[PDB]
């Protein structure tokens with residue numbers, strides 16, 4: 001008897017026979033979509049509606065930030081990279097309009113959540129963060145990200161920060177490492193997570209090892225999650241996990257043990273993406289563990305609804321005009 005949940009994905013654009021069957025299990029708590037699942041706004045809207053007909057309580061998420069990481073394209077406005085938002089005097093509200101406009105549009109197609117914003121610091125070396133972050137100096141990036149979260153919450157969408165405790169300095173031979181003292185990490189990459197700890201609804205851990213703190217990745221470290229995230233930072237939200245079926249991950253064992261290690265470390269929901277066979281393995285482990293969904297998991301449901309006329313409300317006009325006034329909307 002413990003707590004935990006599973007977030008998986010599908011293959012095509014509509015639900016297959018086994019997709020409907022595997023979704024009916026209560027241990028499955030979420031579903032995340034990628035480019036292979038998206039075609040049109042009216043299509044992804046019906047895709048969510050098809051899922052709610054099966055599980056009205058399921059969590060539907062997607063990777064929708066600004067810049068190169070935007071899965072919703074064919075019918076959606078192209079949002080600029082969050083680094084481009086910083087280079088403006090009115091950048092605080094400019095990021096606030098960006099969070100509101102991103103959440104309202106992805107909620108208009110039936111989705112609950114977007115894994116945004118990135119809280120990583122744009123130092124020189126990490127390439128996977130790059131333009132996805134705001135700036136390199138810490139305290140300003142946390143100010144701009146907090147404004148981005150204000151816009152998301154204004155649209156009724158919960159925000160999830162990525163990637164705890166920091167992916168900006170961690171540079172396929174092994175999983176990247178960040179060999180810096182905890183006192184040195186807290187002075188740099190950790191403070192954006194500290195400032196926004198009480199504001200964020202959820203967090204995703206980085207697939208990074210910090211040797212002077214814990215010998216494991218953050219997504220499995222009881223010390224990173226239970227000792228300093230919940231105790232020191234006083235984060236009372238949802239702890240997602242890294243991709244437990246990550247391509248090229250250096251975690252020996254099957255998905256059944258990867259999800260058990262994450263739940264024991266403090267994670268509430270486990271992600272298995274682009275690997276169906278691993279989703280059944282982790283589902284089978286959660287069933288034999290007899291887990292129930294954590295009470296925090298419902299705070300992630302999007303307070304918006306699938307709306308065809310979301311372009312009618314006034315703020316959509318003011319936000320759209322304010323963003324292209326700074327040359328951000330194409």
Ligand SMILES: CC(=O)N[C@@H]1[C@@H](O)[C@H](O)[C@@H](CO)O[C@H]1O
Pocket residue numbers: 063115128162163167242243273
């Ligand atoms: C380091 C990185 O890019 N992390 C991504 C995260 O942004 C995304 O939300 C998640 C689910 O697709 O998968 C992770 O691997």
